[PDB]
Amino acid sequence: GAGMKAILQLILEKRQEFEKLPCFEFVRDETISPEERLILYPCIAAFALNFRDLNRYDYRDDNSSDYYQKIINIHTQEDAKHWEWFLNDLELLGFDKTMRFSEALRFVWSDDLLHTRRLCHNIAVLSHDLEPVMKMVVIEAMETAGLVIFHALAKPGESIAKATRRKYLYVADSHVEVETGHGTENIITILEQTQLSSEQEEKAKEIVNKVFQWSTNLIGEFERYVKAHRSEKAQPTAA
Amino acid sequence: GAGMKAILQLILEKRQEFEKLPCFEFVRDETISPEERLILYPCIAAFALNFRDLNRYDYRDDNSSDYYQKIINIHTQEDAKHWEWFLNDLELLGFDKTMRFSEALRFVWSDDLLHTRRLCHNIAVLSHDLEPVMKMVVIEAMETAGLVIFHALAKPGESIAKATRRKYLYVADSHVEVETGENIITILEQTQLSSEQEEKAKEIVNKVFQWSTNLIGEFERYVKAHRSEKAQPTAA
Numbered sequence A: 001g002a003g004m005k006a007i008l009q010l011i012l013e014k015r016q017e018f019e020k021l022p023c024f025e026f027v028r029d030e031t032i033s034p035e036e037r038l039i040l041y042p043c044i045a046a047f048a049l050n051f052r053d054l055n056r057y058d059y060r061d062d063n064s065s066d067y068y069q070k071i072i073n074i075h076t077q078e079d080a081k082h083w084e085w086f087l088n089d090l091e092l093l094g095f096d097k098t099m100r101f102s103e104a105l106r107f108v109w110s111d112d113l114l115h116t117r118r119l120c121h122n123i124a125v126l127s128h129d130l131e132p133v134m135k136m137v138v139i140e141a142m143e144t145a146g147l148v149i150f151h152a153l154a155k156p157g158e159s160i161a162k163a164t165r166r167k168y169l170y171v172a173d174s175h176v177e178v179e180t181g182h183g184t185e186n187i188i189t190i191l192e193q194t195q196l197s198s199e200q201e202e203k204a205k206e207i208v209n210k211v212f213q214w215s216t217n218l219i220g221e222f223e224r225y226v227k228a229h230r231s232e233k234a235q236p237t238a239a
Numbered sequence B: 001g002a003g004m005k006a007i008l009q010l011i012l013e014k015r016q017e018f019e020k021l022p023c024f025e026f027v028r029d030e031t032i033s034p035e036e037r038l039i040l041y042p043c044i045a046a047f048a049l050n051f052r053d054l055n056r057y058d059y060r061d062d063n064s065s066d067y068y069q070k071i072i073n074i075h076t077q078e079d080a081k082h083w084e085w086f087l088n089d090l091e092l093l094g095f096d097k098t099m100r101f102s103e104a105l106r107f108v109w110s111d112d113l114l115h116t117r118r119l120c121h122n123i124a125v126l127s128h129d130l131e132p133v134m135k136m137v138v139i140e141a142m143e144t145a146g147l148v149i150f151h152a153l154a155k156p157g158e159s160i161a162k163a164t165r166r167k168y169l170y171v172a173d174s175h176v177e178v179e180t181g182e183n184i185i186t187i188l189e190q191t192q193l194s195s196e197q198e199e200k201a202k203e204i205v206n207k208v209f210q211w212s213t214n215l216i217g218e219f220e221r222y223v224k225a226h227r228s229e230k231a232q233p234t235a236a
C-alpha cells in the first residue's frame, strides 16, 4: 500500500544520508593505505558479539508459528554466524594483541565506544513488544545500515586480502554478498507485498529513524577513534 | 498498605530461598581453600561492567524532574563505581591474566556465561517503561540478591585479604557495608501501591530473583568445569 511504500522510501533516504558520513569517505580513500583505513577495526569488538546475541536471543523465537517470525528465524540463524568472521579478520589484521584481561574489558566498556556497545541493546529494547511484521522493519533498517558499512570496509579489506594472499571473511565482499541474500525469500520481498495499518506506519517511521540515529552514533565513535590513531595501522602479515 | 507490605515480604521470602542455593553452600564452606571457592570470580567479568552501565544509562534519567527518579539518580551514582573494585580484586586474586584480545571476548560472550551476561540486559528491558516507584522495586530486589552473593563471597575474600595483607574492595566487607549504607526501602515502606502496581511489583521481584538464580547456576557450573583454576593471590 501507500504506508509500506513511504517506509521503504524512508529507509532509502536514510541510507543515502548514512552512505555520505565522513567515516566512509575516509574508508573509501584509496590514497591512504588500507592498513591505515582499517585502524577502526578493533572498535567493532564492542558490537559484533552483541549482534550475534541480538540475533540468537532477541530477534529469534523458535516457538512461533507466525509466517513473518519463521522467515526472521531462518535469516537470523545465518546473520548470527558472522562474529566468527570478525574474530578471523581481527587475527589477520594484527589486532588480536596479547594484553591483560582488564585491558580488554576497559576497551570494550570504553566511554568512547558507548554507542557502539549499546546499538544492539537499543534494538532489543525497541523490539521487546513488536509483532513480527514490525520486527522485519527493524531488521531491514539495521541490515541496510550494515550493508553500507561493510560495502565500504570491504574496499581496504579486499586490497589487503589480495596483497597478503589471505582470505578475509568479515571486511570482505563475501560478507556483503552473503548478507544481502541470493530458497527462503529476503525480508525486503515480504515487506514489498505487506500493507501497514496507520498505527504500524507511525511505529515503522519511529523504528527507521531510531536504527539510523543509533547507527550514525556508532559511526561517529569510529570517526573519533580513527582521529585518535591516524598514527597507527593494521599489521597484516603476508602469507 | 497491604500491597507494598506483600511486596516487601515477597522480597524477604525470595532472599531466604536464594540464600539456600548450592553455590552459596560451596562459597561458605571453610573446609575448602578460599582460592578454590573464588574460582568463580572471573565469571563476574560478564556482569560487573554491564551493571555499571545499567546504573549510568538505564536506571538513571538526568532529564527527569520526578521526586522518586531523583532518589534513584543519587543511588545510581554510588553503585556505578563498584566495577573498579571488581577490577582491583581481579588483579589481587591472580585473575588479571595476559591473553589474546579474542580470548577475552570469547570468555565474556561464552555460552556458559549467557545468564550472567544478560542479567543487566534483562533488568534494562524490564525497567525501560516503569514509573520511578516501580524502578525502586527493581533496584531493591536486585540489591537484595547482590547482598546475598557479596555476604557469601566476602567470606573467602576477607580470608585471603587478611592472609596476604592486601585491601580487597569487591569480595570484601567494605562492599557489603556500603550496599546497605533517603534509602530506598524507607520510601517503599511509606508508599501506597495500586492493585496494578502490586501485580507488576510481584512480576518484577519474581523475575529479578529468577534471573539472579540463573546467574548463580552458571557460576556453580563454571567452578565444576574449572576445578584447577584457583585464585593465585600474592603476600604483600
Ligand SMILES: N[C@@H](Cc1c[nH]c2ccc(Br)cc12)C(=O)O
Pocket (backbone or CB within 6 Å): A044, A047, A048, A051, A079, A082, A083, A142, A143, A145, A146, A147, A149, A150, A179, A215, A218
Ligand atoms: N553484518 C554485521 C552486522 C550489522 C548489521 N548492521 C550493522 C550496523 C553496524 C555495524 Br558495525 C554492524 C552491523 C556483522 O556481521 O557483524
Ligand SMILES: N[C@@H](Cc1c[nH]c2ccc(Br)cc12)C(=O)O
Pocket (backbone or CB within 6 Å): B044, B047, B048, B051, B079, B082, B083, B142, B143, B145, B146, B147, B149, B150, B179, B212, B215
Ligand atoms: N554489588 C554488585 C551489584 C549486584 C547487585 N545485584 C547483583 C546480583 C548479582 C551480581 Br554477580 C551482582 C549484583 C556490584 O557492585 O557489582
Ligand SMILES: [Fe+2]
Pocket (backbone or CB within 6 Å): A079, A082, A146, A175, A179
Ligand atoms: Fe554480517
Ligand SMILES: [Fe+2]
Pocket (backbone or CB within 6 Å): B079, B082, B146, B175, B179
Ligand atoms: Fe556493589
Ligand code: NI
Pocket (backbone or CB within 6 Å): A075, A076, A078, A179, A180, A181
Ligand atoms: Ni538474510
Ligand code: NI
Pocket (backbone or CB within 6 Å): A228, A229
Ligand atoms: Ni590508542
Ligand code: NI
Pocket (backbone or CB within 6 Å): A125, A128, A129, B128, B129
Ligand atoms: Ni517499550
Ligand code: NI
Pocket (backbone or CB within 6 Å): B075, B078, B079, B143, B179
Ligand atoms: Ni545501592
Ligand code: NI
Pocket (backbone or CB within 6 Å): B226
Ligand atoms: Ni573455560
